[PDB]
Design a protein around this ligand. Structure first.
Ligand code: HEC
Ligand code: HEC
Ligand code: HEC
Ligand code: HEC
Length: 118
């Protein structure tokens, strides 16, 4: 397939829950701009890890049967790879952090520097 342009924004799937603020209803984080051209050095398959099984078509990470949970991350389900927060954080953050350590061009590691659209 062809990668979308750099104006692309990743947001939470509709219905996505959020940790309540004690007793007050919580809210979602800001959305995340994601520029593919800045990740040209990474093979598509590395992120779109099920590409082959999906026959060359690129499916959204949250599609049914994939990281489809709409449940917020807590202690009880902290290890569940089906969670949106785990799927994206493991992919995005780990690489950025590792590159930062090696002192080379990298992406954001701070919450506010990735969740920006607002
Ligand atoms: C990009 C390099 C990110 C960094 C750094 C952090 N987050 Fe993230 N997060 C990222 C994406 C692409 C997504 C999925 C799309 C979306 O916006 O939902 C997420 C998701 C979350 C969520 C779940 C959804 C929500 O409640 O809004 C949470 C709770 C969240 N991210 C929080 C968060 C915090 C506290 C971070 C700093 C420790 C953080 N994120 C870093 C991408 C990135
Ligand atoms: C990780 C750094 C990635 C690399 C390298 C590439 N893509 Fe990607 N792409 C990535 C994410 C996290 C997303 C959003 C997924 C979601 O569930 O929201 C995307 C999105 C796409 C899409 C559009 C999906 C949609 O909105 O329906 C396409 C078609 C796509 N990506 C194509 C693609 C190709 C061909 C790549 C190599 C040139 C490629 N991506 C690399 C993460 C990453
Ligand atoms: C459904 C066909 C999926 C698509 C599309 C994507 N992922 Fe996925 N992912 C899926 C499964 C079945 C599993 C593994 C089995 C299990 O139960 O754990 C995963 C695993 C990952 C992981 C962990 C990788 C590892 O530990 O080596 C991550 C971090 C992950 N997936 C992220 C991710 C993202 C961001 C996607 C969109 C670009 C994506 N996956 C798509 C199923 C599916
Ligand atoms: C390594 C395998 C990566 C993964 C997984 C993701 N990113 Fe990344 N990102 C990576 C590099 C090497 C760079 C720098 C590229 C360059 O040539 O300078 C980036 C950059 C970003 C940026 C731009 C930040 C800036 O300083 O302007 C953003 C906004 C970004 N990355 C977002 C992002 C998200 C949300 C990811 C998960 C879907 C993600 N990156 C994965 C390397 C890698």
């Amino acid at each position: 397939a062809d990668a979308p342009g750099d104006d692309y924004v990743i947001s939470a799937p509709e219905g996505m829950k959020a940790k309540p603020k004690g007793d007050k209803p919580g809210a979602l984080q800001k959305t995340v701009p994601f520029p593919h051209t800045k990740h040209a050095t990474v093979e598509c398959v590395q992120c779109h890890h099920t590409l082959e099984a999906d026959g060359g078509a690129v499916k959204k990470c949250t599609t049914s049967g994939c990281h489809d949970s709409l449940e917020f991350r807590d202690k009880a389900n902290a290890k569940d790879i089906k969670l949106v927060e785990n799927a994206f954080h493991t992919q995005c953050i780990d690489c950025h952090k590792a590159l930062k350590k090696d002192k080379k061009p990298t992406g954001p590691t701070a919450c506010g520097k990735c969740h920006t659209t607002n």
